Amino acid sequence: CTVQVRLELGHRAQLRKKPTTEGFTHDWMVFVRGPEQCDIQHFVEKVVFWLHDSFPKPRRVCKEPPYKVEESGYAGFIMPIEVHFKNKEEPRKVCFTYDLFLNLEGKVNHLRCEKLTFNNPTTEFRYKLLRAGGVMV
């Protein structure tokens, strides 16, 4: 028994008409979502976004959708992202290192698809997966 499920990581970034008081030139938003008509909440406990030091409260947690962070700033950066599962056995989470890159001349619309694979899920975990659009192989 093996179920595969699809995650979408992505971000949008726009240059601001006029900057902020601190000289923040960009507004951006980073997210974890399922593909069209898949609610990943059925198996995702929470998403952890590890923001850069310069941010107040760098460890940003979303326990329910939308799994997202919206901030402003002047520069892009590398960002660890952790997706925790509603799962009482290993693996209980997965990590990606996300590059939030900015366009200094305009907008950025970026999407990135990751396919998780669960070998021999339990009876209760296996729907959480199938409820969320999972597929058996």
Instruction: Please report how many Cα atoms fall inside a 13 Å half-sphere around the Cα of residue 115, on the Cβ side.
Output: 7
How many C-alpha atoms does 10 have within 13 Å on its Cβ side?
13
DSSP secondary structure letters along 6-58: EEEEEEEEEE-SS--TT---EEEEEEEE-STT--GGGTEEEEEEE--TTSSS-
Contact 3, 118 (CB under 8 A): yes
Query: What is d(CA 74, CA 95) in angstroms, rounded to the nearest whole number?
Result: 25
Determine the Cα–Cα distance for residues 11 and 26; give it in Å rounded to an integer: 13
Nearest Cα neighbor of 99 from 7, 9, 4, 1 is 9
Q: What ranges do the domains of the chain cover?
A: 1-137
Neighbours of 81 (CB within 10 A): 22
